[PDB]
Design a protein around this ligand. Structure first.
Ligand SMILES: *[C@@H]1O[C@H](CO)[C@@H](O[C@@H]2O[C@H](CO)[C@@H](O[C@@H]3O[C@H](CO)[C@@H](O)[C@H](O)[C@@H]3O)[C@H](O)[C@H]2NC(C)=O)[C@H](O)[C@H]1NC(C)=O
Ligand SMILES: *[C@@H]1O[C@H](CO)[C@@H](O[C@@H]2O[C@H](CO)[C@@H](O)[C@H](O)[C@H]2NC(C)=O)[C@H](O)[C@H]1NC(C)=O
Ligand SMILES: *[C@@H]1O[C@H](CO)[C@@H](O)[C@H](O)[C@H]1NC(C)=O
Ligand SMILES: *[C@@H]1O[C@H](CO)[C@@H](O)[C@H](O)[C@H]1NC(C)=O
Ligand SMILES: *[C@@H]1O[C@H](CO)[C@@H](O)[C@H](O)[C@H]1NC(C)=O
Ligand SMILES: *[C@@H]1O[C@H](CO)[C@@H](O)[C@H](O)[C@H]1NC(C)=O
Ligand SMILES: *[C@@H]1O[C@H](CO)[C@@H](O)[C@H](O)[C@H]1NC(C)=O
Ligand SMILES: *[C@@H]1O[C@H](CO)[C@@H](O)[C@H](O)[C@H]1NC(C)=O
Ligand SMILES: *[C@@H]1O[C@H](CO)[C@@H](O)[C@H](O)[C@H]1NC(C)=O
Ligand SMILES: *[C@@H]1O[C@H](CO)[C@@H](O)[C@H](O)[C@H]1NC(C)=O
Ligand SMILES: *[C@@H]1O[C@H](CO)[C@@H](O)[C@H](O)[C@H]1NC(C)=O
Ligand SMILES: *[C@@H]1O[C@H](CO)[C@@H](O)[C@H](O)[C@H]1NC(C)=O
Ligand SMILES: *[C@@H]1O[C@H](CO)[C@@H](O)[C@H](O)[C@H]1NC(C)=O
Lengths: 109, 99, 422, 186, 126, 50
């Protein structure tokens, strides 16, 4: 039930550019609780980043993430045509509630 | 080493013998040092109407090494075609009941 | 549970030269200052042994064939390696041998095990206290029909830095699993060390199962930074294990005043070594010697028999409705067929099967020149009269076998069909 | 014989089989599976009911009509005809005439020389079946120090034109010694 | 090749009962914490609940209360979920996902949360 | 092990797995007592040099 906020909601950038993403938490986080997802429309979400600044298996090195405290950032080195989808952030603890973010969208320009 | 057979294979429990028990069930070594003790159990083992608990291995594709154990129930192939674990023509369980 | 550690590809096998290591005691007899000659399955000296490692970041523990015997070895200060698995199919269709070692005990189980693709032992360490170790077995998916179970004290395992070499010869003879082992320190060497070490018997397990392949078990420390399912997170130290293959050979063994093996000579390794076998002494004087020639070993077996694919027109002589009387016994010629007795044994159970001159076993291997089957019907107490050398009514007045008879006698019960009411 | 008779009285069918053993070609054989032959190779063979270990060599020995199989004057099997192929094939041992080891004392050194008696040098690897032998034995099988004598082929020592007194009696006018570095000289 | 199969979909009469179930290929279903994620038609992802390796501790989100029950069957390799009612939340796509955090991972003093690695095919709930 | 002869005190070491002792002629020359751990050497009764 943590108030997560993703800004900006809609991003419009050409392929091959750099996009930055924000996911702010209303309470303190021990920097090991967030996960990053990519969801194409009509299919299930896919894991990208687990924890803080740790890459999941099968995820290319182009995807990156960082952040601590209440400010967290996802940064992409180069935007592929297949990387254009909507992104969500969550945060979970053993007794903590699991809350996904409102979501952000990257779009062709 | 305890086991139940029927009578005509009792001679097969010996070093250097041929038969249903010596070749596919229980093989004695050539240099065996020990004793074989066999006694009647028609009052005990035999059941009215037939007893089917005891099983003997009928078909196997090799002659046994001495003092080993095999309980595999894979289907024997009496034909060139594979049985694929399905009972049918030229495909039987290696184990069979004495009755 | 299982974790599919995946080696993108197997690295090419690395060959290292075994340095005359691995000779076990043949029997539990105290022998002192006596040279003893024995012929047993043995690792040839200077054989090409494997150099398989554990972590490079691949986790490579592939299955290897168990042809006759395996000479295993291990070189790590931390006990990364623990036990082995032995079997022929390793998919729960046959009986497999499990050897696993945890800190308190060693468990040996013979059961039908469904082994995972990459089995291992999980070691979990409480944060900030390595002392708290909890172990989860990730070797077998399931177990069924356990015949032999054995629990005992742990094999010597490490808990002034030193590396402790552990060598384990496994042999399967007559349904007995013989294990020989000896642990020695390692100091300033990277590969299998020189010198001589003799392995002493430790257990003799009557497993009685078919062994064709074996695989090494590794204990991997768990890292919680990356998830358990992924290959990452199972980091351990760098440990390399050796695997050799035993081939039958004849080795002279040298004992010492105290009764321990110190030196060995393999006749096959050198012509000079063969001279030592003949003289029965390690020391050889100057001159010329003639030696017994047994350096040649068989490598293949070829079988040649004539083209006869026809099952025998026995005429169902065994199943014939009417047999001959004993005063006029019928003799039938057998020619141009391949004699198979397996069908006859399945068809009927024979009470008396006594063969003279030819053994009842390996009789199917041998070719027979000419066969004249003589058939008759008698009573039970006269059956012993059929055997040569013994007399009776049948032997003296009805049917006689010579003293030099080479053949077989087959007698079976016929009270079901040859007995008439009244 | 009666239905309720005692076990001794009950009839027991007896069939006796009488075999002659390898005095003629065998019309009846067991269910062993025949495999192709490997000529001039140290193998275990089961030819027409005789089992052995050795190499098999072809020959053109003629035989009498009744018995294709033959026996030697010591009653050893001089030749047994292959069943599938009518070519005459005789057993030759893997072990030829016994090798002679020529060595100094083990106190001095460990180098040895091997004399293959009554065998031509070019035929020595085939006679000893070097491919079957261990690689260390194989180095003894083929070498630059190869000398052909009337006694046989000596491998492992260098021959010298200079004449010295005999120390090790090789034979046939050849002798060996250990001399300077230090090596076996013939 | 890991695959989680969704079932129990389709449009039914609204209220009082509906059945969902998620299967899992292989024999690694047990001992892995599992969560249910519901995908709104146009409002992003949401949470349903969580069950541990043995089901001793269970927790639910604040979006729904008193209508959901989660249980796991070890032998059938299928996890079962039940909705005691069907509210105005319609056309919601429900996924089942497996998280590698095993019992040992939270047994160790380390406080770590991994990611929802593998997801199901999806289903339609109306 | 049944035999006639002399039982003498022995200081020969015995490995635990080994129970009997044989000489270079392979015949039995040493043995361990079953009840207590002492080692007894077997000695021919008549030297026969007489
Ligand atoms: C112990 O297990 C091994 C298998 O790991 C057994 O060896 C195998 O025996 C079978 C017959 O039972 C062989 O199958 C045959 O293969 C040949 C071609 O090679 C084919 O022509 C035959 O029709 C049949 O399919 C199998 O190849 C063989 N495998 C090996 C490794 O040799 C072995 O017999 C078992 N030993 C005992 C007696 O328990
Ligand atoms: C090592 O493994 C053995 C065999 O599993 C353990 O021995 C038994 O373990 C079971 C639980 O798996 C207990 O219920 C038994 O009471 C144990 N018996 C004994 C003799 O201890 C052993 O405890 C394990 N040790 C370690 C290091 O975990
Ligand atoms: C051992 O390996 C080496 C290198 O692969 C090879 O040359 C040799 O023939 C092998 N055999 C021996 C001699 O052990
Ligand atoms: C680590 O564990 C041991 C044994 O359980 C204990 O004696 C020691 O105090 C522990 N160390 C800690 C908790 O720092
Ligand atoms: C286990 O044992 C039973 C006999 O009691 C046998 O029926 C079964 O085939 C065995 N299980 C196997 C082969 O997996
Ligand atoms: C025999 O053992 C004793 C005691 O360990 C030792 O002092 C002696 O050197 C050993 N001798 C031999 C021949 O190994
Ligand atoms: C002998 O006859 C019986 C039927 O009386 C039959 O079942 C059996 O297979 C026969 N055996 C042979 C082929 O000799
Ligand atoms: C034996 O029969 C096979 C076919 O089964 C044939 O190929 C082979 O040439 C025959 N050999 C003889 C002895 O004629
Ligand atoms: C050779 O013999 C001498 C005694 O004549 C001895 O001192 C020396 O140690 C021996 N050397 C070897 C290598 O056996
Ligand atoms: C074989 O030895 C004989 C006898 O010395 C000799 O005449 C002949 O040339 C030799 N043949 C070969 C091929 O070496
Ligand atoms: C030794 O004799 C051989 C015989 O052919 C000859 O070739 C060689 O040149 C001789 N060596 C010397 C040093 O005379
Ligand atoms: C990986 O493990 C799964 C079970 O979770 C199994 O179905 C699959 O066949 C395994 N794949 C490999 C690469 O062994
Ligand atoms: C056997 O037991 C008796 C009675 O306890 C004891 O006196 C005797 O010494 C024992 N024998 C042994 C083990 O030496």
């Amino acid at each position: 039930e943590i108030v997560l906020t993703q800004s900006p909601g809609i991003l419009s950038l050409s392929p091959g550019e750099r996009a930055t993403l924000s996911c702010r938490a209303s309470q303190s986080v021990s920097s090991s609780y967030l996960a990053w997802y990519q969801q194409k429309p009509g299919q299930a979400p896919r894991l990208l980043i687990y924890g803080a600044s740790s890459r999941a298996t099968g995820i290319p090195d182009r995807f990156s993430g960082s952040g601590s405290g209440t400010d967290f950032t996802l940064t992409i080195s180069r935007l592929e045509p297949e990387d254009f989808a909507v992104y969500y952030c969550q945060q979970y603890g053993s007794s903590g509630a699991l809350t996904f973010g409102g979501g952000t969208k990257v779009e062709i320009k | 080493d305890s086991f139940v057979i029927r009578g005509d294979e009792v001679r097969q429990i010996a070093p250097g013998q041929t038969g249903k028990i010596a070749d596919y069930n229980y093989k004695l070594p050539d240099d065996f040092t020990g004793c074989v003790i066999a006694w009647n159990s028609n009052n005990l083992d035999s059941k009215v109407g037939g007893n089917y608990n005891y099983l003997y291995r009928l078909f196997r594709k090799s002659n046994l090494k001495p003092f080993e154990r095999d309980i595999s129930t894979e289907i024997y192939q009496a034909g060139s075609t594979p049985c694929n674990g399905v009972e049918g023509f030229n495909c039987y369980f290696p184990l069979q009941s004495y009755g | 549970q299982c974790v599919n550690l995946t080696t993108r590809t197997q690295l090419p096998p690395a060959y290292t030269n075994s340095f005359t290591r691995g000779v076990y005691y043949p029997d539990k007899v105290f022998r002192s200052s006596v040279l003893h000659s024995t012929q047993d399955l043995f690792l040839p000296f200077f054989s090409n042994v494997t150099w398989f490692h554990a972590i490079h970041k691949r986790f490579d523990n592939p299955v290897l064939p168990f042809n006759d015997g395996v000479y295993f070895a291990s070189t790590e200060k931390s006990n990364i390696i623990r036990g082995w698995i032995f079997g022929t199919t390793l998919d729960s269709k046959t009986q497999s041998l499990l050897i696993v070692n945890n800190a308190t005990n060693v468990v040996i189980k013979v059961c039908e095990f469904q082994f995972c693709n990459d089995p291992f032992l999980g070691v979990y360490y409480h944060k900030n206290n390595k002392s708290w170790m909890e172990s989860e077995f990730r070797v077998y998916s399931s177990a069924n029909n356990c015949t032999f179970e054995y629990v005992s004290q742990p094999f010597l395992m490490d808990l002034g830095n030193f590396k402790n070499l552990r060598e384990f010869v496994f042999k399967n003879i007559d349904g007995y699993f013989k294990i020989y082992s000896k642990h020695t320190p390692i100091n300033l060497v990277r590969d299998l060390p020189q010198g001589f070490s003799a392995l002493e018997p430790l257990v003799d397990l009557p497993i009685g199962i078919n062994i064709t392949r074996f695989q090494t078990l590794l204990a991997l420390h768990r890292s919680y930074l990356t998830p358990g399912d992924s290959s990452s997170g199972w980091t351990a130290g760098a440990a390399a294990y050796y695997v050799g293959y035993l081939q039958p050979r004849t080795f002279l063994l040298k004992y010492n005043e105290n009764g321990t093996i110190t030196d060995a000579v393999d006749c096959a390794l050198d012509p000079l070594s063969e001279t030592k076998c003949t003289l029965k002494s390690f020391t050889v004087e100057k001159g010329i010697y003639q030696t017994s020639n047994f350096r040649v070993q068989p490598t293949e077996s070829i079988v040649r028999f004539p083209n006869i694919t026809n099952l025998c027109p026995f005429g169902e002589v065994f199943n014939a409705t009417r047999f001959a009387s004993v005063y006029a016994w019928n003799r039938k010629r057998i020619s141009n067929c391949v004699a198979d007795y397996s069908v006859l044994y399945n068809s009927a159970s024979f009470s008396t099967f006594k063969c003279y001159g030819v053994s009842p076993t390996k009789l199917n291997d041998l070719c027979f020149t000419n066969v004249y089957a003589d058939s008759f019907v008698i009573r039970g107490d006269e059956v012993r009269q059929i055997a040569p050398g013994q007399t009776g009514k049948i032997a003296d007045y009805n049917y006689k076998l010579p003293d030099d008879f080479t053949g077989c006698v087959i007698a079976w019960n016929s009270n079901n069909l040859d007995s008439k009411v009244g | 014989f009666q239905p309720t008779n005692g076990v001794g009285y009950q009839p027991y069918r007896v069939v006796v089989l009488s075999f002659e053993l390898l005095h003629a070609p065998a019309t009846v054989c067991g269910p062993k599976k025949s495999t192709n032959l490997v000529k001039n190779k140290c193998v275990n063979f089961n030819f027409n009911g005789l089992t052995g270990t050795g190499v098999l060599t072809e020959s053109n020995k003629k035989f009498l009509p009744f018995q294709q199989f033959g026996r030697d004057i010591a009653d050893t099997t001089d030749a047994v005809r292959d069943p599938q192929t009518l070519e005459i094939l005789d057993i030759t041992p893997c072990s030829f005439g016994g090798v002679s080891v020529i060595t100094p004392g083990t106190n001095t050194s460990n180098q040895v020389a091997v004399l293959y008696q009554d065998v031509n040098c070019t035929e020595v690897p085939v006679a000893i079946h070097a491919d079957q032998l261990t690689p260390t034995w194989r180095v003894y099988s083929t070498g630059s120090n190869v000398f052909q004598t009337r006694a046989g082929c000596l491998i492992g020592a260098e021959h010298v034109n200079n004449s010295y007194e005999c120390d090790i009696p090789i034979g046939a006018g050849i002798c060996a010694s250990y001399q300077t570095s230090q090596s076996i000289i013939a | 090749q890991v695959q989680l199969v969704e079932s129990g979909g389709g449009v039914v009469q609204p209220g009082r009962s509906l059945r969902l179930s998620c299967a899992a290929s292989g024999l690694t279903f047990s001992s892995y914490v599992m969560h249910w994620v519901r995908q709104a038609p146009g409002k992003g992802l949401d949470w349903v609940g969580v069950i541990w390796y043995d089901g001793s501790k269970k927790y639910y989100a604040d979006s729904v209360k008193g209508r959901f029950t989660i249980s796991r069957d070890n032998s059938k390799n299928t996890l079962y979920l039940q909705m005691n009612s069907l509210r105005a939340e319609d056309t919601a796509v429900y996924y089942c996902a497996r998280d590698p955090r095993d019992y040992y991972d939270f047994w160790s003093g380390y406080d770590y949360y991994y990611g929802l690695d593998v997801w199901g095919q999806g289903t339609t709930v109306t």
